[PDB]
Symmetry: D2
Subunit: 246 residues, 4 copies
């Protein structure tokens, strides 16, 4: 059990990729800390994992509020004495082409997807370098490699988290702390359930595996990167798109 | 005279690469609008170019203030009837290790370097698509490709502007408007005179041409990209580093 | 036991990363076919793994000779009924500055490192698409991302295998066959013992983890990519360098 | 006239991008040496440029025959005393999916597109470093960035020439010799004239400028890169695709 006893904080863990990652991490023996802006939902999520015998906890955290981030990290240290893994998965989209995008749409996405990631990483990175081991995993996107129509704000933020990744991999690597990113393509979470079938068909046609990912297939990449199997993987952004013509 | 009569707005034009770009664009026949937060200095810069016979103007613009950006664009239209080129060159650094970076250091760099670029591009893009031709050139950095120690905020921002570049190239290209980025390496501008020699030796040794760039050598890349010689170059980030090992 | 009963052909398996990969695959339950130009050595390597209880076999294969490749594939099918995984790890260097590189130095590296990879992949790809599942893993290098002094031929070949990877991921992905590459940095294999200390200090100082990899740390990446944990990873080249400034 | 008096060797110059580059270089004042495997056609091409008053010469060169390459370079030195620019543009395609590609198809493309480029660059690079200035420009492709169905051989070769580019930029940069690559997308040369319209429409739909390039639009990028406007551009592969979703 490759993450046995390791303490993992996962943001956006109430549902979607975040929840799938919490589940997989618990299966790999991690102590999992599920954080989400949605308090009731994340406590239900944690409750489902606790029933399996896993050691888990749940916190309401808005990652744009550094005081909430700090309070959670302090509570995790009080409870489990260390932080071994951070998965910066919480994100939002507010799509609009440049001609129509509002300042509020722009700001909201930069706040969660860049400032939020900065807040959580800054809050744990010192704990990790002090103990001489840790891993910070950042959620990017294929859009963070290639751009995408209507995603001025999202693309900037997901490119930007690769900037974080390479910078922190440089700063923290020498102290035994690895920093990597995952760049998912089209993943079959709740966000796609209202998308018209013909639109989904266009999406899957652009994928070289000709299908959407299940969230567990992104979780499994975070699990690899957290584990010692990725001990010489640092500063990378792994594309998890099945291959794409975006 | 490959830019003859074309109207170019350049931000951060009082000095450094911005001023060199204004100088080169004027040499190539462009009508140049020099914008900077340093009003007296950008006025003096414009005066030097006017003395050579160029058609120029000078505006105080804080790119984080959209009303100021909009007012400048309106004034340029009143004076010169159209906008053909935008060079988003204004940027700042507020360097710190992740461990030490303050919220103000982080927020300020995201504001100028991402929000400011968004503001200027959004302000001109409709003018350009309506007339069926235009070019937006974004200043990135080698740091926006590879990250860099102490530059959590700057690296996120310069990665992010490549996200803008690809996204806007997708949205605007079909309307005849190209969007590209330049990623300079180490440039001999005013910000380097105070830097220690052994730091500059490390800079030059990591460059495959074994020397710093002069600002004119970055200006000439912007001039190429603005010109019709780059008519099939869209969505790219051109590294202008002499080759390097950062 | 994530590769239990899966049949893996590994080229260059007598030593180095190839042998470490065979060892790890066997540890994960794979049936391993060790191939190398050094027959006695790869036989001894297989014997070490068989002593641990693994199901293994050992073949002399010069990957530049397609009849030898084909004969080995036919033998594997006769023995084990299918081929599930191919690791194209055999490669050579024949380093020289452009000024001095001989035709033989150039031709030989292209032959083993590109033609050999082509030969092995073509020999197994139809088996994999016919059965609806398979994975081909190609050995690249950080040199296949950034180039390197004295490696005109090697760099072309390791860039080229990423070209293969993306192309085959496009052709074979829709049939259920994934194709990926690994780009190792500096690995503590047998080829480094003779290397001067000050050359190795330059290697480690350019790595953001400030150490060389052990071969098992590259093997574990191949093991991940072969496994179902990488089921939505297709067409990628994963840098396995600890982060670096080459 | 930015290439005045500079001696430029261009391979594949009888038609297509090569001829367009010869024409543009002559317009920029270069002494142009047109090389092609097609002797009658390249002499006609040269004759057209000579009529404009340009200084030009024509040679039959098969770039896979080093003796022909060497003889041409010697003849150019005898005639013009130096070589300032090399454009490695000659290339071929022999497309087939991996399942069907023959050894001869593979070999032919590697021979022209990698060995040929090596031959020409090796033959001139010493002349350039000795005089302390030169530029070598390599023709890659968008396929050398992203791969493409049916192009195992072409993609490997055009990735591979970026490997050459980065390696030679490293080796030769310190001696004042720059090496860069251009990666064209879909260009309206003779090769596309038999392509069905509906197929061309698919191609242009995937282009963010929604049109094919004219060959002069690729020539203009080579002209920039050869000129002193690109004096701090070294080791780069410039995508000239209009933006693409390949």
């Amino acid at each position: 059990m490759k993450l046995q006893g390791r303490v993992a904080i996962i943001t956006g863990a109430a549902a979607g990729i975040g929840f799938a990652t919490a589940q997989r991490f618990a299966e790999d023996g991690a102590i999992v800390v599920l954080c989400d802006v949605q308090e009731a939902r994340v406590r239900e999520a944690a409750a489902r994992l606790a029933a399996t015998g896993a050691t888990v906890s749940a916190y309401r955290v808005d990652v744009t509020r550094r005081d909430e981030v700090d309070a959670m990290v302090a509570a995790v240290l009080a409870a489990h004495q260390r932080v071994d893994i951070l998965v910066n998965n919480a994100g939002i989209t507010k799509d609009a082409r440049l001609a129509k995008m509002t300042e509020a749409q722009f700001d909201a996405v930069i706040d969660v997807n860049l400032k939020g990631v900065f807040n959580c990483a800054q809050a744990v990175a010192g704990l990790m370098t002090e103990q001489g081991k840790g891993v910070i995993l950042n959620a990017s996107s294929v859009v963070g490699l290639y751009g995408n129509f209507g995603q001025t704000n999202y693309a900037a933020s997901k490119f930007g988290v690769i900037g974080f990744t390479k910078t922190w991999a440089r700063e923290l690597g020498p102290k035994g702390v690895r920093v990597n990113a995952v760049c998912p393509g089209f993943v079959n979470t709740e966000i796609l359930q209202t998308v018209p079938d013909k639109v989904l068909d266009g999406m899957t046609s652009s994928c070289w595996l000709r299908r959407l990912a299940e969230p567990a297939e992104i979780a499994s990449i975070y699990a690899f990167l957290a584990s010692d199997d990725a001990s010489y993987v640092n500063g990378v952004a792994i594309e998890a798109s099945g291959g794409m013509s975006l």
